[PDB]
From a paper:
The translational activator of cytochrome oxidase subunit I ([name]) was identified when a single-base-pair insertion at position 472 (472insC) was found in patients with late-onset Leigh syndrome (LS) and cytochrome c oxidase deficiency. [name] and its bacterial homologues belong to the domain of unknown function 28 (DUF28) family of proteins that share structural similarity, but their roles in cells are not known. We show that [name] is required for COXI translation, binds the mt-Co1 mRNA specifically and this interaction is required for association with the mitochondrial ribosome. Here we discover that [name] is an RNA-binding protein that binds to multiple adenine-guanine-rich sequences within the mt-Co1 mRNA.
To gain molecular insight into [name] and its RNA-binding mode, we crystallized the mature form of mouse [name] and determined its structure to 2.0 Å resolution by selenomethionine SAD. The structure (residues 74–294) has the shape of a hook that is comprised of three domains. Residues 27–73 were disordered, probably due to pronounced flexibility. The centrally located domain 2 provides a platform for contacts with domains 1 and 3. In contrast, no interactions are formed between domains 1 and 3. [name], with its open state, appears more flexible with a rather high averaged B-factor of ≈57 Å2 in comparison to ≈35 Å2 for Aq1575, suggesting that the interaction between domains 1 and 3 provides rigidity to the structure. Domain 1 is widely positively charged, domain 2 has both positively and negatively charged patches and domain 3 is predominantly negatively charged. Indeed, RNA binding was severely compromised with a quintuple mutation (R74A, S75A, R76A, S79A and K80A) at the base of the hook of domain 1.
Residue numbers in the entry: 74 to 294
Write the structure that this text describes.
Amino acid sequence: RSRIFSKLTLSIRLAVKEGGPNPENNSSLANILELCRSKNMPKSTIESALKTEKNKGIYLLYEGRGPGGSSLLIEALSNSGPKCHLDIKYILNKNGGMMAEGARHFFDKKGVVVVGVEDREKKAVNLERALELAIEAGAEDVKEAEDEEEKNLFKFICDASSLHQVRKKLDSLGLCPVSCSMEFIPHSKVQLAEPELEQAAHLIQALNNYEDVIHVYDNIE
């Protein structure tokens, strides 16, 4: 799909800015390229994204408010910050939201280590034990989650800086880290009703449809 390919181009460009255009030296870029190939993105399109100048485009993070007092984080890569800012504000405003003024940083980038509910010794890890190990590893928060199977899991949240150390300590303490990742976490969440939920989805969809948007984050529970 052409919209998918446009987003995947933005992701290639952002990965080249962070680690260079050689996927042998940039594992994040290598993962994106694999996904591109899995979606049947033509080589010509991949190469054009790969060979775009590292200095082209501005990476942008805009905060806004949606329907029911929700909070939004709009992640974008644009050739014109002013057009992108005006356009995102227009999309927010036309769908009942608003652009947050100033330096409201309602979302924080955080590290996230996912780990299974079983020790190296294949013994159960209950929440109380996950919490004690989180203290010892320097994790800021622990969430109980489920994957698509489904099956139980633990999400250990930390300072984005410390992602490296925490995964390592969790492994040294006997836990089984499945995956590492960066996520944008809001300070608090809101609950929306049905009329507000459908509106929020409409606004989010409109923002995802904008050409420069990579991702939209929200605090809707």
